Symmetry: D2
Subunit: 268 residues, 4 copies
């Protein structure tokens, strides 16, 4: 009806109702989009969470590390949206880093296997999602991934920040490939969102000093955001993703939109 009217959009990464992807999906639906959802390891839970969406959406299984899931993904989406229909939009809202790559675990002590797994899911999967789905995307389409500005190092995020640096770089290459399809690829760099995991880390699940650091990070973020930053509100990020999913940023690709309150533009 409005922003995304008629668009067909795959949204990955809903796991709980505080998933950023939950709000992206909600807002996209409110904006006229038709969704296909993907979920990874807790499918029954995703479905039960997604029941709360403004509209029903087919849910497909996708373990971004499973090569068969990816191989079959486009066929499954075509099944879900019907033959001869294509996606206009793909949202990657997927990220993971083993606990060793994060928080109080010393940066040097994260074993490569762990880091590799995190980079697989958090960075490489952006490309492999774009590989699976570009064949079934319309000209004018839009792939959006979720980013957390890794331009500068920060406490606790450790190897996830490295993963995000890799993602940003993947995104620029995906844009090169997507452009052949008339498709844009972009990242939304969000401010900290109080996701279940984030609340758990502030509460110390990855060590006390990590939790204290991330709490300071959050406070500093809202302080230097010229328009403030509400970490309990994923809506301004969901809207931003929708902005990129829409026809309203048609000359932007390979790029990063910062939905962070303007915090990254301010030193103090």
């Amino acid at each position: 009806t409005g922003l995304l009217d008629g668009k067909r959009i795959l949204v990955s990464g809903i796991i709980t109702d505080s998933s950023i992807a939950f709000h992206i999906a909600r807002v996209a639906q409110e904006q006229g989009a038709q969704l296909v959802l993907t979920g990874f390891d807790r499918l029954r839970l995703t479905q039960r969470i997604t029941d709360r969406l403004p509209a029903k959406a087919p849910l497909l299984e996708l373990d971004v590390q499973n090569e068969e899931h990816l191989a079959s993904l486009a066929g499954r989406v075509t099944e879900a949206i019907g033959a001869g229909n294509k996606l206009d939009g793909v949202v990657h809202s997927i990220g993971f880093m083993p606990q060793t790559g994060m928080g109080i675990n010393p940066f040097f002590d994260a074993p490569y296997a762990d880091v590799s797994k995190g980079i697989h899911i958090s960075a490489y999967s952006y490309a492999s999602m774009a590989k699976a789905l570009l064949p079934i995307m319309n000209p004018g389409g839009s792939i959006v991934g979720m980013d957390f500005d890794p331009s500068r190092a920060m406490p606790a995020y450790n190897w996830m920040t490295v993963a995000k640096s890799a993602l940003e770089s993947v995104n620029r290459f995906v844009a090169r490939e997507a452009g052949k399809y008339g498709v844009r690829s972009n990242l939304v760099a969000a401010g900290p969102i109080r996701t279940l995991a984030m609340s758990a880390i502030v509460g110390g699940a990855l060590g006390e000093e990590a939790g204290a650091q991330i709490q300071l990070l959050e406070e500093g973020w809202d302080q230097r955001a010229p328009i403030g930053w509400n970490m309990k509100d994923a809506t301004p990020v969901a809207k931003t993703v929708c902005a990129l999913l829409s026809d309203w940023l048609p000359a932007t690709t390979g790029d990063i939109i910062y939905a962070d309150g303007g915090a990254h533009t301010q030193l103090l």
Copy 2:
């Protein structure tokens, strides 16, 4: 009706029908916005150009270097939109650099007075427009200025690039001030647009080697843009500005949106 429905938006910088601001204004109107226009030194011409807009819009005089124009500006806009109404949107699409600051004139030979004038109109005026208009802007409002990525030096643009670097920096401070009003401030970094002036420089008005360089710049831009770059089409930039004028990028301020085909994200 759509993107900018109900919004009231001042658009500066229409001088010809190939002004970027012409397309911004056209698109904003198509998207439901109500406009107040400003024009500088050729008011009769601006009016005659703007007659072609989808809707009529009050045109106000604003010479960004005239302190009285700025002092009176908000009152004049309030007159134009009616008492008790405010602006939701301000577009700065203003830039100028004396010929000595550009093209074949050696970078070192631009006299400071010339450079100063260019920086006044091209950079400082962004702040002084925000000063004049923030008192008459609604919470949730949006100031947008036009940028040309000055991260790296380039032939011919010389002191205008310096002016743009200054603008980017002004924009981050304006965001600090705007945030007090619940207002975002952002720049759109556009790709090269074949504006009358740009066509004139490609044709050699600022020297042959400058024209040859800018023609190469343009070709290179479209080449590395993963989705291409059409310098004859200001529409993708107008849409981008509208995107920023809208409620769809609500967490972005002090920032730069690149409507350049993705060209800045690619080396070759």
Copy 3:
């Protein structure tokens, strides 16, 4: 004898013994360089300060806003270093912004004349120094200016940050011109140094809230500097400038070296 042995280097910007340029000059002398100094409005004071340098150095008057000073500068330097001798090194350590462009004076209230003056001295003069001196610089030479990272807005520095953004951009163009002479042009982005002016602003000369903000800026800087930041020690910055003046960064030009403790690479 060591780093700068045999090099002839103009150093501007010594005004007190806590001038960054004082330490640059001291270190360059310790490293074998032969200096010509320039001073602006307090020549007797500069001379008396410079008497403390490890070696005597001719002092020349240069008001970067005085076109005759600039016109005569190279002849005066040639007089000072002797006919047929050239400079290997130029240090721009010059900056000024009227009080209205800074601190507690609202960013919007700085009159353009004031801002223009600040940008003249702080940014444009880098080019006009390079114009005066490149004709008398040797292949392999090095121009270095002093920068304060203006990538993000910050309290109190207001229009000086804008000035620094303009400088960074000027530096990239100066590099284009300098390269014709076989000369590098680069900026050193220093951390906050407790210069007389800086101490005065921390003490509130530009308003209490500005002083409080700059004190917080300083503390935050040392906190996120992975190797710390000592604002009372200009030596690590002087060394960095010498590094750039030397043959040891021969492939770096148009660029910015950050002598800030690594602070800019860290978010928190």
Copy 4:
């Protein structure tokens, strides 16, 4: 005797005499440094290459993917430099990406195992080298890794660019850890160097179009370098690394020094 007099420096990554690390090692020796070298899979060859160095240097085996090599590394270096002696300097000049991650092999077709291996050797190993060696580094020490600016995507370099983005990010975290030891960590972003591998790719070993693209990349680099770029001369990069290994950039860490001719600062 000069720049690195008395310093003890581990240099990894010599494999042929056109290895960047060969020139780093040569220059460091010329500058007074005492070296320990490491070599990976062709030890007899490294030794035979290193015989040509100005001075003899113990060569140690280090397969950055071998956890036992890393576990033993510091003991082996202490053996080589003698008990109670420490390193002042560590050079990481290590990089690898399987052919599938590069050139004409479509970016989407690089299998994760391949990419992971490349990121292991090219990015993660920078951290794991810093882990092995920081316990045996002196305050004031310097770790330097080799970077190729991955800020923008480019043809052919594909997943190696992603690897370099990951490296840059690793470097910022390593700086955090190194600072505890009084140690700096920095990257040198070099211009293209005609290394054996690079010559082989220009000659088409990774596909014709890749070779054509990299040849264009190289030409463009020298064109926009304000001081030119000689891809056949690794010396300006070796000097830059030495600059970072020295006491002359003491306030720089977590950072990237661009030894690229200034090319990255120029658009065209």
